């Protein structure tokens, strides 16, 4: 299992130049989503690239 | 200009150009995780100097410094917070020091900089004067201080611990403003309503960024009714935040404020929906809620009735507890558990002081409506008497909060109606609140006696409801000449256990003996009854003492240091001393002794003018054994029915002056140091000095003429009297005699004078004798007296 | 309450020169009875003195 | 006559009555709360000798001793005890001592006296000689022996601190037995089947009451097969133990001894009810619960198969009382209800309950918890091995305070058992469960190492657990142990060292650990565990511990010698000792002792004289914890997804060693040094020079040569001789005389005109004769007067 530093040093691997995604809305105040997401999907169980590289912006 | 509602950067240095053309920007402002491979071409933007909310920076490869890219940032506001944090800078690379030198005030939060090995100039800048609690900053894992060693080109002000320059970086010192009082360019003050940095001191409309509020370009600490605060920084009509491009997935107006949602019993008005009329959160897919910061306290802010979980894991912070009750004292029920864990920094947990029902509709495992763990600090419920709690099903926990008193736990457990459903396996005494005891039972310090150094106590005989339950005290004593006691277990001053038998089978009153005592001392001592709780059964508080302050008997103190004797006049001997290092007890007044001391037998008689845990336990465990073997026995055996010496008092200065001062003399004198006591202790001991005056003679001549008698063949005979008062003594009389001028050396002793009056020398030549007399002592040769003229007839 | 020495010593207190009850049977082996019967009765909750003296011998 | 099957007595000091007519008492004799007012008349009972259970003494008022009532009792069997007691003496008052001096022996349990203000003479007697496990006794509470001050008018034998006498009270000491072998009257060993005391030796129908058994007078080992065992002590006939007024509420015979009852499958034969049939099953349906305390509580257990109730265990106290245990609960396989277990410090392992292998837990304790430990001090490893099997039915487990008890195994019994969907981190927790002490963990591998006289550097291998984040500090400790028997728990007082290293940083090689300020030379015992958070419980994670290493360290030069003494013996022969360096500093192989000859005085040569506390670390892990989800949180929050030379010697054997060339008086450099084993390397010790001046002599210290004179120009006495050579020291006053007939005048010839020209010169002095009266004199004093030496001026 891979947590800590190391996510966004692997996240840099497999990204590089292409750039990571957000899901930029405009919106207004806090109804707009919230602040688990990643420590659950990388941190309590091994992530493969499969599952990680989907966080890079196309 | 403004720019909303937000700004991020990422992976893209020339997304900097969306920061081009707006001098504020509303919503977060993220910058994270740029590469740089892209040209750094420093880009300025002295437009942009106050955000509302936190300011992110997260890996930006290839930047140098803040001043480059965020010349004339002032404040920021911090209104929506992150984590705690309203300026987070973390794992900085090539960002060897911070350029933020405009900055001047952040409201909300707390700085966080952390994980950067190639930043300094931190402990450098203070930030008590920019932010408004600094007690809540985070700045660890950067650059070591002594493998930085920064300088400055800004005054010294005391950083906690020393003054010190305050400096931004190489080039630049921070800004401040002089004693006076906001601040202009130039150290003057500024318009009340202004904030940071002004154009034009005294001003509404020249204000960079002022305070409390905005508005068209003018300030005010409340914007007329026409206009209604914006994330509490602007104001803005109707006509502005009813077309706003709200996207919540328009706002409304309270109290001539208008947000995004209503509370509950207010909804948008029919036909006049940018209006709310009187007439509720909770996820309900998450089902819980947990609460780290208050950025998770403030999504819940406005919460009337919360269908889920509550998780409270409040790590560290100041008194947070303020915004806590704030943004999440207004639920009032919430569905399922409340549990709460390494929550540290809840002193206590009234926060949530319109909390009135726990449905606890679906529990923990094994029905826990409630829950406790690790809470280093939660040192009081809130379960007061103006507190009601009702919890509707589900048990209850509690475990290892080393504060919490277990009278707390069980008052709350009665009020909110779950005894039936408790268990000592559930809510323990072993580790909750083991660390602090807030009452016990009385025990009243019978009588006290003391001594010098020596001390016995004696209380009333406790006895616990089973009387074999050891009763066994431990005294603990402390030297604190104050009042600020802290109660807890020793060693470096704090408190020193001693531990005293049980009352053996003589029942009168237990006592306590302490010698080895420092005199005079305020000792802070009290007893504490520790006795086995046997069973489980609950309960059983202990007893306590009284904290009891008492000051031992006075002693003898020491003998004075800085003791030395110096003489400047005659009839004025000056001797000083200094208070003991051990005084024992309030000094009142010296007295102070002097003795003329006799001359010396040998120049004068011979003359010469010619309870470590382990054994606590396996304590604990002997004493239940004794109990359990005497139960069964009492079980098994009965069965039912079917020269004299002066003296003076001074005690005010230091230097006391003695008379009769005669040149060269060797004087004895001692010292006592006599305490406030001293009717009947007397007084201190004998601190004796010797000394000797000063030398002098002056003219000690013979007092009358040195006659000259002749005898048989001619011979140098003397008479003369003996001066009263030499240097001390006469040693060695420097007379002369020659065959017309004495000019060889003559030593008239006073063994022939004491004798017959002058030597002797048969057979001399005659001639004319002019005397070089020179009065002499054992100082040396003394005064040359003129020639005189007493002669052989020649 | 009361337990232990105060018991005997009550105990001792009440009978005196009457004597305690012992309910002799000659029986063999362990099967006779067995060896709570008092600290329940007195050491748990306060025993008085009618429910105490009945361990007396008549 | 034997009594059974036991006697009581109350109330009444009378009653003794009934222990008239019976030597022998088979069960438990009690004598308790008997008045004062019937007065002592000295109720000797020389008839009772043995007993077999417990005998209980409880506030006997107005009894002064137990010689007096008991006189020839001499061992108590202990058959049936009473709470690991098999006598015990309680609350006694005007009992000043104790009077059992004809006891021998006790096979079963252990004394206990207690609370009794009168009595002594128990630090006198040693108890290991009488009864077989002491450490099972209980002494406490009696006078103290600074207020007894005993004195006795029976040898002297150290019990673990000292020898003294022992004896039984001011009268008479207790009796023991020659080394050589039983034990009878007057020094001599009996047979074999006997015990304690016998009349006659080598006897089987002697014994005042014999081991192992007892039969018609005689004694055997194993009794015939006519006979049956009773109570462990007796043999009876068919008839004895079937007529029996047993009064349960007769005996059956399995293995060819009668008792009470059979063992499950085992029933009363059909028209033989006194004899048994193959085709217990315990436990009251009342109480249910079986509290367990002492083998008193548990031997009314054994015989049973199933236990239809709760079990309770707690035992306090004891020595390896398993062992018994293992004997009355070794035989239940099935319990009803749940299994509690509190304070039962005595169980080092739960062994000793094998045949469990069910729990029904058919009726719980509260929350429905069918199994439940509580502060079991020592409970340091249960039962759940490979061995063994083991189900509970239903209800939940809990697990708390056991500070031995490690969290592997108890998860190792939670998954044999099949509960493991029923617990939880609140019942079985690891902050209290055996913090103490910890079997398995992770292995920690020592990458390398260095060492130096005084540092030590070590490295290990980088342990990364599944979260690289948390916070993997290293503890180092070290103890100087000059042994392999180590204990591995937390320092203070000699146990250990804490050393704190910090983790390795973004450097990712090997973190090391740096020691300095180390005695040289010796076998220190380092090893270093992984301190590590772990957020949510989820259980488990074991840490990591290393190997115990063991490190010599580099060595360096030895300190002085002591003892350093110097001595002379003879000419040539001067002897100096010294002893081994307080700090050797390494293995000694061999001295280098030098000596150097020193020139004298220069002052006589030139001017010739002849005329880390919890607080910061909980504050540490709570640190650590909050950088750990803090930046969780961050990377959670940013992403989102996409839709005069000198004389050397080598002598080490001994101590002392002599030296040669010793010119009387010539002060030396004898200077010692200890070399070690690495002295080509290292060197030696400390200078340790010793100026040592050897023995007086003179020999022929008088002139060596004729004393010859010379006159002059009006009469003046001139010498001429030349000089000793080895002279006491140095010549100082050369006694000689002068005189008109005889020389009665000292002649002081100093050495100094003697040098210059050879002797004095006294012009114009008076003639006549001399006879010289020569001291050869030295700086030690006047010298050896020679003889009248006739040289003389003319008369």
Known sequence: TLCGAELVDALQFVCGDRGFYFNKPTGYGSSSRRATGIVDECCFRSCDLRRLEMYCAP | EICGPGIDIRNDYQQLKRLENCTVIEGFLHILLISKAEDYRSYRFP????????????????????????????????????????????????????????????????????????????????????????????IVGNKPPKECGDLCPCEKTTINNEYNYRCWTTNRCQKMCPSVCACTENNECCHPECLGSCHTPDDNTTCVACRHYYYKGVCVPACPPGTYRFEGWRCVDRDFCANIPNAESGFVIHDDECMQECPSGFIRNSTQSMYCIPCVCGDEEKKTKTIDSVTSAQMLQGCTILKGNLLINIRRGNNIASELENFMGLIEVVTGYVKIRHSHALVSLSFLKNLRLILGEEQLEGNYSFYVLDNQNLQQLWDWNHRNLTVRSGKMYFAFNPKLCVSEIYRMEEVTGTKGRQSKGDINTRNNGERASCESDVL???????????????????????????????????????????????????????????????????????????????????????????????????????????????????????????????????????????????????????????????????????????????????????????????????????????????????????????????????????????????????????????????????????????????????????????????????????????????????????????????????????????????????????????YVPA
Not at chain 2, 61 to 73: H, K, R, T, Y
Not at chain 2, 82 to 109: C, H, P, Q, S, W
Request: proline share 6%; hydrophobic share 35%.
């Open chain 2, 47 to 138: 437009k942009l100097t106050v955000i509302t909310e936190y300011l992110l920076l997260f890996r930006v490869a290839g930047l140098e410094s803040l001043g480059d890219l965020f010349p004339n940032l002032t404040v920021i506001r911090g209104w929506k917070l992150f984590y705690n944090y309203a300026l987070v800078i973390f794992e900085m690379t090539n960002l060897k020091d911070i350029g933020l030198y405009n900055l001047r005030n952040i409201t909300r939060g707390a700085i966080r900089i952390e994980k950067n090995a190639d930043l300094c100039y931190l402990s450098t800048i203070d930030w008590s004067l920019i932010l408004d609690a600094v007690s809540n900053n985070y």
């Open chain 2, 444 to 790: 009243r310090f019978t009588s006290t006696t003391t001594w010098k150094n020596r001390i016995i106590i004696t209380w009333h005989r406790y006895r616990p409801p089973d009387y074999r339950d050891l009763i066994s005290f431990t005294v603990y004593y402390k030297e604190a000449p104050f009042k600020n006691v802290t109660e807890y277990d020793c060693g470096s001053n704090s408190w020193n256990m001693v531990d005293v038998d049980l009352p053996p089978n003589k029942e009168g009153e237990p006592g306590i003996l302490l010698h080895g005592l420092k005199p005079w001392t305020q000792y802070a001592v009290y007893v504490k009854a520790v006795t086995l709780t046997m069973v489980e059964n609950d309960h059983i508080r202990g007893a306590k003492s009284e904290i009891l302050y008492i000051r031992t008997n006075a002693s003898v103190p020491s003998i004075p240091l800085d003791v030395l004797s110096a003489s400047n006049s005659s009839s004025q001997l000056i001797v000083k001393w200094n208070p003991p290092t051990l005084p024992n007890g309030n000094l009142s007044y010296y007295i102070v002794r002097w003795q003329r001391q006799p001359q010396d037998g040998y120049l004068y008689r011979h003359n010469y003018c010619s309870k470590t845990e382990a054994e606590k336990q396996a304590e604990k465990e002997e004493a239940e054994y004794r109990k359990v073997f005497e139960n069964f026995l009492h079980n098994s055996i009965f069965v039912p029915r079917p020269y004299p010496f002066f003296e003076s008092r001074v005690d005010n200065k230091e230097r006391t002056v003695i008379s009769n001062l005669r040149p060269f003399t060797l004087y004895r004198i001692d010292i006592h140091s006599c305490n406030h006591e001293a009717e009947k202790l007397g007084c201190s001991a004998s601190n004796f000095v010797f000394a000797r005056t000063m030398p002098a003679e002056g003219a000690d001549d013979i007092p009358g003429p040195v006659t000259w008698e002749p005898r048989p063949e001619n011979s140098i005979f003397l008479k003369w009297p003996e001066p009263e008062n030499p240097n001390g003594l006469i040693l060695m009389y420097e007379i002369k005699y020659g065959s017309q001028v004495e000019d060889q050396r003559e030593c008239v002793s006073r063994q022939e004078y004491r004798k017959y009056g002058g030597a002797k020398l048969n057979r001399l030549n005659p001639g004319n004798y002019t005397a070089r007399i020179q009065a002499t002592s054992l100082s040396g040769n003394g005064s040359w007296t003129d020639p005189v003229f007493f």
